[PDB]
């Protein structure tokens, strides 16, 4: 969506509303403001920002990085906007295929029985807490971990 100044070109990334729809969502003032915004990366995860978000000129290629088992938003604090501005605001993260690695074989552990024996869910609850996130859910059969943050 060139017209809104939004920069998102990486393969596998998408927005909700779609980049094509955001292209048709520029108001009389040159601005693209949506109510509820998701940026996702298929196979990896998504980040949902509730409420009114001004997307104008957002350089999502530089700002948002959804990787295996982690998200990075604003990689440089010198370029991070104040609390409540841009994407530095409350968000709900969904990460896909969040599974432990076998200590000797380095293989992914997906069996729900082994996951429950390690209490992997409790590992994710503790990891959410130690990072200041609010644990929401873990689905073992898909490895989907959901948690919420106040900002980035």
């Amino acid at each position: 969506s060139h017209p809104a100044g939004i920069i998102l070109t990486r393969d596998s990334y998408y927005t909700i509303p779609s980049m094509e729809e955001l292209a048709r969502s520029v108001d009389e003032n040159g601005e693209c403001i949506v109510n509820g915004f998701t940026i996702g990366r298929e196979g990896f995860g998504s980040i949902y920002f509730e409420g009114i978000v001004n997307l104008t000129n957002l350089d999502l290629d530089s700002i948002v990085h959804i990787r295996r088992k982690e998200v990075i938003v604003y990689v440089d604090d010198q370029n991070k906007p104040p609390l409540g501005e841009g994407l530095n605001r409350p968000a709900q993260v969904t990460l896909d295929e969040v599974w432990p690695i076998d200590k000797t074989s380095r293989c992914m552990i997906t069996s729900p029985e082994r996951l429950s024996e390690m209490n992997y869910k409790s590992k994710l609850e503790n990891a959410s807490r130690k990072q200041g996130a609010q644990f929401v859910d873990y689905r073992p059969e898909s490895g989907s971990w959901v948690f919420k943050v106040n900002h980035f």
Partner: nanobody
Amino acid sequence: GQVQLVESGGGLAKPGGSLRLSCVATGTFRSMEDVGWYRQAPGKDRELVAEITTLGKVTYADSVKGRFTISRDDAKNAVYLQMSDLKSEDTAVYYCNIEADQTKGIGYVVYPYWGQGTRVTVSS
């Protein structure tokens, strides 16, 4: 990310003796998660000796329970095995396994790392 392990404390003791194994992790990681000591003798599979998960659960192999004591220091990122009442079957190379949290943003990226090990010989 990078992790380097330095294992030490292995040497020779006779039956009934004592040693202290140590492993120190450095590198770029956020924290140590599950940590454990293992051992491999010739002709055998590598076996778990003792472990402390990131949640605090402790586990000993039946053959060393009450003789070996694992502990961890999460300020210094080090893992120790106090081996007392050593028996000749304890002879093996000992390996510390350290799970490193390598997350860069928010998440739970964890990979396990092995060292080159430290040799224990319990001789007659």
